Amino acid sequence: LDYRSDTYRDAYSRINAIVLEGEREAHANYLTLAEMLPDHAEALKKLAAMENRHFKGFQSCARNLEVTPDDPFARAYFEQLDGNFQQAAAEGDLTTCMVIQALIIECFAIAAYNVYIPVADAFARKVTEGVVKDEYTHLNFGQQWLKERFVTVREGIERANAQNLPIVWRMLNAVEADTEVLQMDKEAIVEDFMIAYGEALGDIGFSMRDVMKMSARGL
């Protein structure tokens, strides 16, 4: 890999912009949740703050490669998923909010990060390794929220999955050419994303049958 090439920098402008927009939305979304759930505001504001630290880290990765992120691209990339989060929050549908942010986006991001790490330039490797470690180690508020409420929210989780998992797949397909330039295998992202999502859904309380049904809805 030539990290300094026009080709790599062009792809990175879009991939980096996507990660930054994802982190910007995560920060905003955890602040929305903190406003709606004042008893939980300290934990949610700490998650927001962590997202902002990760944003700064990925910004430094772009600066290191002299890449300007393609922000209009990334805003459009996230528009549909972001809209579903904001509409859910508007309806007080915290179940969907948690599924989108704490399960779907979280597993998708960690999958992508894990596929990027072995092919990342050394600076970005170090930064991304710390981001992943942070995600593994810190409180996943939304996962715990859902787990604690499993019997009452399970149908809503299934609805949120059916609405939003297909959007994941479209997003992944949309950047296939750019992930290829970065030497990230799309299929590795798919596999990592699904194994993590199944582990998280199982922790919440879902069975094998249940997770298989949710995967079929993503199709």
Ligand SMILES: CCCCCCCCCCCCCCCCCC(=O)O
């Ligand atoms: C500097 C760039 C790091 C690149 C890593 C590979 C990225 C490939 C695209 C995958 C997009 C998913 C990003 C969503 C980010 C937000 C996740 C979160 O808030 O936990």
